Amino acid sequence: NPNEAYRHYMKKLSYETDIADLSIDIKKGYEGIIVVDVRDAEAYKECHIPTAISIPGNKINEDTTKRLSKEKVIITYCWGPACNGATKAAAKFAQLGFRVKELIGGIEYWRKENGEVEGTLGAKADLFWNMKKE
Amino acid sequence: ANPNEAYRHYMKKLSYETDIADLSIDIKKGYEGIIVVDVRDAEAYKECHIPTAISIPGNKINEDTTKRLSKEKVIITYCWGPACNGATKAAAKFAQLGFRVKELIGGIEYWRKENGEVEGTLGAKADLFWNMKKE
Amino acid sequence: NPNEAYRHYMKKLSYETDIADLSIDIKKGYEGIIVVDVRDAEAYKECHIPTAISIPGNKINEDTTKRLSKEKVIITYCWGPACNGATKAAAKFAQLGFRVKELIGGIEYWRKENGEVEGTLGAKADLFWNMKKESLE
Ligand SMILES: [Cl-]
Numbered sequence: 001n002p003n004e005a006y007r008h009y010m011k012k013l014s015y016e017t018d019i020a021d022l023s024i025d026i027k028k029g030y031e032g033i034i035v036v037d038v039r040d041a042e043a044y045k046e047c048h049i050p051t052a053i054s055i056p057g058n059k060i061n062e063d064t065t066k067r068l069s070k071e072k073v074i075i076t077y078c079w080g081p082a083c084n085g086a087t088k089a090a091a092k093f094a095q096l097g098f099r100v101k102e103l104i105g106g107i108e109y110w111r112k113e114n115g116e117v118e119g120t121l122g123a124k125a126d127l128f129w130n131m132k133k134e
Numbered sequence: 135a136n137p138n139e140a141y142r143h144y145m146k147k148l149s150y151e152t153d154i155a156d157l158s159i160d161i162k163k164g165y166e167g168i169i170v171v172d173v174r175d176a177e178a179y180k181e182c183h184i185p186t187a188i189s190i191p192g193n194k195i196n197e198d199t200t201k202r203l204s205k206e207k208v209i210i211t212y213c214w215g216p217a218c219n220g221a222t223k224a225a226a227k228f229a230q231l232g233f234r235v236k237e238l239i240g241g242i243e244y245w246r247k248e249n250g251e252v253e254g255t256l257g258a259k260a261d262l263f264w265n266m267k268k269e
Numbered sequence: 270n271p272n273e274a275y276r277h278y279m280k281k282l283s284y285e286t287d288i289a290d291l292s293i294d295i296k297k298g299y300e301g302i303i304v305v306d307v308r309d310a311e312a313y314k315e316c317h318i319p320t321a322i323s324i325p326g327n328k329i330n331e332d333t334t335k336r337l338s339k340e341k342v343i344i345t346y347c348w349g350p351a352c353n354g355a356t357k358a359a360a361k362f363a364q365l366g367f368r369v370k371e372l373i374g375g376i377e378y379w380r381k382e383n384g385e386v387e388g389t390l391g392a393k394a395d396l397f398w399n400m401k402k403e404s405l406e
């Protein structure tokens with residue numbers, strides 16, 4: 001029924017955010033969020049989203065987030081739609097008592113949507129995770 | 135989890151959405167039990183949209199703009215693609231209006247990547263993705 | 270609240286797996302999973318994921334799954350993000366009593382993430398589903 005549907009979509013929206021919404025908070029300098037790149041350290045060093053900090057997914061714990069305020073909202077992101085990293089991170093952040101949303105689209109679509117990137121390689125970095133690279 | 139719980143989950147998920155495949159079918163056979171609604175900006179629509187689809191910007195979904203729509207048909211909302219949440223937000227507003235709705239995963243982005251035809255001013259010449267930098 | 274949030278995220282993962290996780294399973298030779306390609310038979314024969322068996326979604330039932338172990342886990346995959354195949358498939362498998370998870374990204378992102386492909390056309394096969402090829406097949 002309509003009511004059940006409404007609750008469903010709203011709830012789904014409460015656990016996520018898209019490239020468009022993020023691009024606005026960054027552009028307006030909203031400080032109510034902390035953008036966290038949960039991919040590999042070297043991946044972040046080569047290319048990452050503006051204002052984002054690095055915290056590889058397997059490194060999320062009390063020590064690596066001691067400086068993060070529980071008053072803000074954590075936005076996690078991985079490579080893209082084909083990655084589950086952002087989701088695994090969200091669970092860990094949540095377990096640590098944070099309010100968290102996962103970015104849908106990842107850095108892949110942030111770039112496809114013509115977003116700016118920072119890093120050692122920038123727009124020259126690989127668009128996708130390379131399963132064979134390692 | 136166990137099969138019983140798994141079955142419920144997957145079925146439920148399927149009840150709130152639909153893919154490019156199922157859409158193309160109802161469009162090919164001219165099914166009229168649906169109303170394809172483009173939620174993106176008015177300009178994007180006019181430039182390139184899915185066949186049989188109407189234009190209703192997400193931020194404009196309300197009683198006034200949905201007065202000619204029949205609660206008898208099923209609403210199918212769609213935005214740019216996997217990176218957009220428009221279709222989802224649109225579904226909530228539509229369900230809030232007492233409608234029966236489903237969001238289209240893939241957006242018009244995959245409708246094209248899947249050799250789908252489009253109508254509009256620029257047609258297949260329109261940009262594939264949303265441009266953050268465009269004013 | 271954090272508590273509910275944790276339950277939500279954990280449950281979402283319990284019904285899926287990604288390219289990365291599957292690649293590690295294929296490489297480590299894990300036998301606790303059964304990769305099932307749910308697309309059209311022809312598509313599979315042309316290009317599919319290593320160690321995966323062909324079982325078209327519309328052809329899933331007790332006859333085609335009789336020789337599959339219930340002790341393992343079924344991983345379904347369709348073309349990609351814009352497909353519901355794997356999800357419809359998961360449901361049927363769950364109805365048959367199997368433990369199952371769907372692969373997000375499908376074969377599309379498997380190949381994009383530089384994955385190996387086996388089949389007739391291999392890496393030369395089409396990357397996306399062709400809406401027109403249907404009438405022609
Ligand atoms: Cl108005």
Ligand SMILES: [Cl-]
Pocket residue numbers: none
């Ligand atoms: Cl692409």
